[PDB]
Amino acid sequence: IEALPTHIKAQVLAEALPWLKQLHGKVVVVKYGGNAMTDDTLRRAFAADMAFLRNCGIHPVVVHGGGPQITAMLRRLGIEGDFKGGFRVTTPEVLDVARMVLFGQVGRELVNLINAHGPYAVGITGEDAQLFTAVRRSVTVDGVATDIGLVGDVDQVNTAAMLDLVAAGRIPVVSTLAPDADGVVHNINADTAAAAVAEALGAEKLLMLTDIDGLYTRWPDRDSLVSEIDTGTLAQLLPTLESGMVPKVEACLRAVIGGVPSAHIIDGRVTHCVLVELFTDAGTGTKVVRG
Amino acid sequence: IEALPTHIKAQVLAEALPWLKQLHGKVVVVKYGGNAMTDDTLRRAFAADMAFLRNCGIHPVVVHGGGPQITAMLRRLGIEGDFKGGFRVTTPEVLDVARMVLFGQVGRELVNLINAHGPYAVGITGEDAQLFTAVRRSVTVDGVATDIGLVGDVDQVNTAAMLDLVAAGRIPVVSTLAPDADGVVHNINADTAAAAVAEALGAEKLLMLTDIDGLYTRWPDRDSLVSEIDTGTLAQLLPTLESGMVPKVEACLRAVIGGVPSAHIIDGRVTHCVLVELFTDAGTGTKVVRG
């Protein structure tokens, strides 16, 4: 990159300024999962980007998943699962494993990566300081909605305590587990939790790292890839997408409808995808806004 | 307890006042382990006592162990251990399990118990916000000191950030894991970590919950049980005690020598042992002070 003329290094940084101004002092919630979480080089770049935002006076809040890691640990423990539809039943035993993997394994890796750049990251679940509660959710299995154990949606968020934590300069690394109104901890889909945290905290942007270039209207058609879309159009479009895109898309709608100015589905396989999406116009993601 | 005359209910509470004054606004560090951690009734009482202190404007900091739980999980995972002397070697794999059990299992139970009384508890390790570092320790096996993996002592403590967390009204629940100066996370003996946190934070008292009535000079002699002792006497006495008492005792010396006004070894099998030790003169523990 040193064969690059210095006058063009200058212009790339200069073109970041319109977005430094837009995001100064603001909350950006990032859903982090996928190849950006499993590959070492993408990992270290993601953590450096959180340090970047932080050293610009931007306020990142990281919400992370970890589905495949939970599965692996359940297999290592010989815990036989029950499956309704394509869904595993979250028994009390499965939750304990989920919680212990999400918070005591996956969240730890990111906290330590980020913290290589300074005392920024702090891990939390909705259990800590009663930061958020959960409400048990049911699922639709081929027509009928059904119960699959201690799985839920974010219920209420302690908006005030969360933003105190962020104003104190900390990067909250969130593992999506929270107690219900009776104190029974549920596991929450990390995508939908990111959308709820973003809306609760008045985030300026929601970033959803995904293992795809962006939203395709008519996948596989390469020409069908869109760069920006409104909630109304995207809602009518949603019952048409690959099984894996539904949660990422539903998050963007819930968030953007809920007042978050924009939600972005960006390519987590691109090194420093966060910096390219936020500080560059050459991003590959797709931006969702209200309409 | 209602057959108890009201005029004596009155006097018991009145006699708590000399200790409410002594402890008002102050930090009390509690090592929590043993039967007080495994039994349901003692569990709920311990958490209620932390809520009590907190609702008196006293500042508890909880440091917890969990040795037997780590062993069990290693056995459930089929992870064969190596043993030098009576010590298990903490490989990278054993640390990941320890960290995931301490922080993602044991600490969670206490956070949720305490938090049944309000938004108080918050879990943390030395990894979060760089709260404390670790230095690799060696051990003495029948004469010679040896290496047993990623096990260490608390190195430095972020005293300022810790007391901000406490002034914000939070009860820090600490899992004893922290990175070394190179970012490699070590597991720390929970007893010695409690002594280091107490001294770093200028605690007024160190409470060490133990499965015994108190320190015996000449165990089994029931008459040999002492109520208070100075560091000088207790140091010359230390090479004489049951294997299990050494860590609890070494903690009290390191702390009290380090300026903590008193450290107490109290009976964790007594319901509300924290309240009896702090707000009553009828305690069963033994108090260590400087001399």
Place this chain on the structure above:
Amino acid sequence: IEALPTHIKAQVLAEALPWLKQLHGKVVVVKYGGNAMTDDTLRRAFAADMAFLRNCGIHPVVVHGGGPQITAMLRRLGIEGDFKGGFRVTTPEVLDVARMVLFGQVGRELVNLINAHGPYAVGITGEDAQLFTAVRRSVTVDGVATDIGLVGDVDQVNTAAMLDLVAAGRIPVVSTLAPDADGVVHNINADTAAAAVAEALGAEKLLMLTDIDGLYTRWPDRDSLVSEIDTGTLAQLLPTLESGMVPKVEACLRAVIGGVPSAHIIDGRVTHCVLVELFTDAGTGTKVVRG
């Protein structure tokens, strides 16, 4: 009290916690008079209880009477009184004596008692920092309302300045004298002033120390003693009580109707009646709530 098993000392303190939580950070106004003011042992216990509340992060505000002491001083001064009905006329001369006895004698004893436990108590009248004003009141003498000099009801309260004084950690000891809108100081019935301070400051509880076990519906019938009653019932009941109970009762109605969650008439002849009423369910008082 040492013959009392330690496990029951433990449970008495544990049962205080539901009320420590309820009252944490809150204002409790206490009317203090009667035998609790004249007997040495009750005196010292009352002051220790104010220190207790304070060392729990509860905010006591003490309003005191002193009728019999004013009478005595007037007799020592040879000041002949005029009496309309059963009421002494408060001339300018009688007010000066009242003010000087209430603020310069009675309030001083309590300030010095409380302050034996720390720098808490501070004496004040509505004159200081313009904390509250008075409005001249008339009285009903056998049918007709009449003028009995410079006696009044609390008019307006400097709510903000009062709670600053309390947030600064001080226990306000209030002598019920205040200027009217023209600067002429009036004496205020201490019971009704306690009710006005409690309502103005958003107190959580009003405690009225009285020389009786509690409110009797049909005094002398011992069985007629009630433990809790609503304002509607008690209002229809009020024109039936002993002459001395009317002021204590009228205070509870004015306060509870005014939004104070509960007002209590408690036995001031019981040592530490404040602690038993607030931190115990075995209290002898009667609780008034809205309805």
Place this chain on the structure above:
Amino acid sequence: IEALPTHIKAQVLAEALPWLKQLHGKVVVVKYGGNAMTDDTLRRAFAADMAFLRNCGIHPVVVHGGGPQITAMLRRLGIEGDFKGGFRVTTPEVLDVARMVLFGQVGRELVNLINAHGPYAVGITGEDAQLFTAVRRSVTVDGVATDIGLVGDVDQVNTAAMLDLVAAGRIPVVSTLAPDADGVVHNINADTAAAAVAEALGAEKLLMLTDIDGLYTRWPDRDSLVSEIDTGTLAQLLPTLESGMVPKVEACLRAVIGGVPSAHIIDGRVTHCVLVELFTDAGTGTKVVRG
């Protein structure tokens, strides 16, 4: 005063500015007694001057006496005094009367006068919030020092709490009574207490209102009246003055030696003597400074 040309009204106020700057933000302690306390017109002017200072962002602290008023009340109460030398013995009974007269009578008049201009004045004794303690003093009766009861000198001052009270915008009206180290309240000479408060609070000036034009070297010689004098000269001069001037002079030395930049003995029979001494060069007082 309206026959006075407007251009000279202008210049008088303009010439106040060098002293407005000198005193801005600073503490001025005023001993108030004598004819300035007993005459109605001087009274109202003194209180207006305290309001003046306050509305300039200057911080007055008023310390008041009241000897003759105590005597009168003792006579009205038929309390026979004991006299060693020319000194009355302060029995427990005499103290109660002194305290009740100073704090519940004399201090009240000034609080209400000052407070006619706003919520400024607040009465206090060393008893309140433990603001200051007293140490029992003995006296010299024709050669030998002797005990005359509960009379003392200011021992320690809660400098911090006092200046918080002043930074909150309040004019402390101080009655000179305070507890000793055992809680027994003593009465303190108001002149010497003013000197101790001034020095403790880092006052810029000490004003001592007196019923005289100023210090005379060789009273009655009218020419012997001095305008300024150093502590060294005045100390060698002190054993030569009228009985009444000794306390006012000893106060100025203790204060000025103690670091107060200047202490002034000013004519309390001059209306608005405070304003003329502070904001004018035409003052009649005598200024004491270090040397």
Place this chain on the structure above:
Amino acid sequence: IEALPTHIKAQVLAEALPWLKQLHGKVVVVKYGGNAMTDDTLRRAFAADMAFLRNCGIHPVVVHGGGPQITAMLRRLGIEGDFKGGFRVTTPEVLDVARMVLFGQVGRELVNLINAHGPYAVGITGEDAQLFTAVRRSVTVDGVATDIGLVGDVDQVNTAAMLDLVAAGRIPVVSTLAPDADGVVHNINADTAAAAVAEALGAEKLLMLTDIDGLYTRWPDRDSLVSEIDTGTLAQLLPTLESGMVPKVEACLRAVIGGVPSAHIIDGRVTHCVLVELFTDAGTGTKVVRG
């Protein structure tokens, strides 16, 4: 002034107190121009008066003109003017000169004068910290409104940032230049700008220094000079006054109608006219209030 008896120096200062109370903590905006700006003795007195206000905890904000100085500099620069009606066209070149004279010459003199008394004065234009914007204004030339270049009225004021600057203790010296919504700086009539700043900042008073004794109803009739007048009367009166009085009068109406309690037209040729108008009843100015 020393031949003046001290008891009358006392009374002049005492009579300032009703206005010290009225103005304590408040904003007073002063338009400064005319002979009070050009004469050395009036200059130094004006600056001392701003220091006076400041050392009373009053908040002056100074808005200054400088028309004749701009003319002179344009003549020294040989810049030929264009005149529509009696108005000079403010070309880009004339603005640069105006800005450079107002801010870099006239404002500097006052900042340095005021600052001889302390670190108070600070110069600013609407350009600094975006304190205020301008909107291009047109003028009426014998019937028709016309364009005379980059001249405008104050558009919006950064009320918050301005009062932060004043709460920090600074005396803002304002040169009336500000950018329009496109960033093009305009020059603003200093009289109308004073009226807009006073209203924006919630000023208690607007002072307009003028080279006249006050408003005359029927100039030259000496008897026609009025001391106070309401906005309704003065508005119907405005189309009758000397050309020079219109701007000063229009300012007072815009301000007083806009909620400023009073605006004063005072004689800037009187030394310390600010002190006589604010702290004396003998002022020569005329007070405008709402009606």
Place this chain on the structure above:
Amino acid sequence: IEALPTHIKAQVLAEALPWLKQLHGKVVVVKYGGNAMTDDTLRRAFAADMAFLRNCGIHPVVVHGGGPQITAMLRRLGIEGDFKGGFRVTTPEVLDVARMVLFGQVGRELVNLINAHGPYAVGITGEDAQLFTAVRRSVTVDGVATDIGLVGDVDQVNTAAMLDLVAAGRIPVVSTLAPDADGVVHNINADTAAAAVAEALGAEKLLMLTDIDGLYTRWPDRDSLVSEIDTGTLAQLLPTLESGMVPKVEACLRAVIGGVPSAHIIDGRVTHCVLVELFTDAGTGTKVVRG
């Protein structure tokens, strides 16, 4: 710049992070003059860079020159100069012109440029709020030191008030004029003033924009251009450089010796030279550090 692959736009921004961390929360003083001040494109880029720093939570302080502009205005005014050596004598008349050009012309352009990005820039001289004083300096003319009027060096800096201004979020644009100890304003060489402000405010870096690539040891030898040098080496080197480099170099020594970690001489003819020097390793400047 869009033909540039997105993965290299990503890496350029990522490589800025080590310097974002180094400079976070810190003061950077920039001397601004030369072609970077006169050319429109460099102008707008410099102001955007100050906005950049500011939107990263870095604290720029801009010190500007303007020598050639003063000369031009003196010529436009027909003010004949006196010259001792190669130095113009700064008469009172020349200072007024300098001050009016520096503060009322040159500083205004930069304030308005910067402020196009937000309410950041604020102009000031040492006159405002007494921010800094000047001490008259003499100069060396062919051997002998001589007087050339009201020209000086920065004497003392109000470090506290300056950093309050910066903590409030403002970019101070400094025109180098300040009063001496008698209030007579002097003009200060802008290079030496930048060095004094940087050292006074504890700046992390001093940037000196210059119309050259960097320091040449043996100019014209292109190979003699150095990238970094210590103060000791550079001091022995100083009496060898082109007349124009002496002031820029003397500034770097005074600053770096005074504790500023590094001072940089950077090419002001390079667009966004500030961003390339601070956030890139490809800079053309030369870095001075202590040794």
